[PDB]
Amino acid sequence: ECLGTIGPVTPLDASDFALDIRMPGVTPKESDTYFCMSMRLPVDEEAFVIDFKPRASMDTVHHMLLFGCNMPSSTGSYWFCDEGTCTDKANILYAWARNAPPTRLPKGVGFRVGGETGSKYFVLQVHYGDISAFRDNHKDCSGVSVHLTRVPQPLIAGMYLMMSVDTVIPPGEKVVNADISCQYKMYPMHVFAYRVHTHHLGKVVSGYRVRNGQWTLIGRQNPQLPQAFYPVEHPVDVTFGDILAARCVFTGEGRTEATHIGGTSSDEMCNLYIMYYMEAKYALSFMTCTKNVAPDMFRTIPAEANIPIP
Numbered sequence: 136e137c138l139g140t141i142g143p144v145t146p147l148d149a150s151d152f153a154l155d156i157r158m159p160g161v162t163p164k165e166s167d168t169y170f171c172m173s174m175r176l177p178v179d180e181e182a183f184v185i186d187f188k189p190r191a192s193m194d195t196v197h198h199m200l201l202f203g204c205n206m207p208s209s210t211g212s213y214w215f216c217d218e219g220t221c222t223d224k225a226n227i228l229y230a231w232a233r234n235a236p237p238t239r240l241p242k243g244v245g246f247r248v249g250g251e252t253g254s255k256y257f258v259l260q261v262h263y264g265d266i267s268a269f270r271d272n273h274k275d276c277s278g279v280s281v282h283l284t285r286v287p288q289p290l291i292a293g294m295y296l297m298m299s300v301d302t303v304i305p306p307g308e309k310v311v312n313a314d315i316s317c318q319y320k321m322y323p324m325h326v327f328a329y330r331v332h333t334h335h336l337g338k339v340v341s342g343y344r345v346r347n348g349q350w351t352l353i354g355r356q357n358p359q360l361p362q363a364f365y366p367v368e369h370p371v372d373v374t375f376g377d378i379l380a381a382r383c384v385f386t387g388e389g390r391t392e393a394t395h396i397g398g399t400s401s402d403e404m405c406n407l408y409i410m411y412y413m414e415a416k417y418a419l420s421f422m423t424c425t426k427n428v429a430p431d432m433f434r435t436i437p438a439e440a441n442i443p444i445p
């Protein structure tokens with residue numbers, strides 16, 4: 136699968152091209168190795184990401200994530216993602232998970248990149264699980280083919296990130312809730328996909344839109360299942376005056392010391408990635424909620440938010 140003499144850029148037609156984002160023939164020496172690499176966009180003008188095709192080794196790649204950003208964490212050929220993904224904010228565009236197949240972008244929908252305000256780089260994370268296939272000492276070029284176009288898209292994809300920052304999980308503690316909430320104050324977004332992220336202590340993650348005190352399910356997932364972007368059961372609009380609300384349920388069981396929010400496996404995260412589309416003339420590409428503005432509101436959270444997925 137390694138790119139040879141033809142390189143990473145395929146002409147599709149007048150205004151479209153495929154960009155292949157692949158590891159430069161890497162060979163992991165340990166299990167659960169996270170490798171990152173970057174690619175500058177080959178065009179300066181604004182472009183739209185309208186499709187993704189995975190190029191994974193079905194024998195060694197556990198997951199892949201693709202981000203857009205302006206400042207990749209390294210200037211090197213490739214690095215361990217422990218160093219970081221991007222030094223500015225990494226905008227997730229795509230997740231590929233083993234045993235949980237991705238869902239296509241709706242037609243007419245694209246991420247805006249490049250230009251004056253869009254991402255100038257793609258960063259690709261590859262999670263290598265079982266490295267028993269690397270007994271060959273073979274070079275791996277797993278990654279993702281992205282379909283770019285110059286043609287403006289009627290609908291712009293973006294990300295609403297809900298994330299905990301203050302969470303403290305005391306050791307042995309049966310149940311710890313991490314609650315996130317913000318008022319929505321932009322033009323309408325329609326949620327079409329969601330991804331959940333915790334580390335090993337996470338039991339369930341749920342996101343809701345609350346309007347006039349009524350809770351509407353965006354997504355609810357066990358974070359110990361493959362962390363792909365999952366389609367929303369039914370399209371959900373989030374509109375001015377709505378509150379977005381999310382809860383991660385953790386346990387402290389099995390830990391001798393307290394667990395707080397951080398980047399390592401002995402730390403936790405409570406992340407819910409809400410992938411939306413917006414009308415192009417109304418669109419903004421990213422929003423983040425790191426707060427809990429209506430904590431008392433969580434008294435009426437559906438009971439399913441506290442119950443593990445069977």
Ligand SMILES: [Cu+2]
Nearest residue numbers: 197198199262
């Ligand atoms: Cu993985």
Ligand SMILES: [Cu+2]
Nearest residue numbers: 333334398404
């Ligand atoms: Cu994490």
Ligand code: NI
Nearest residue numbers: 325370371372
């Ligand atoms: Ni609608």
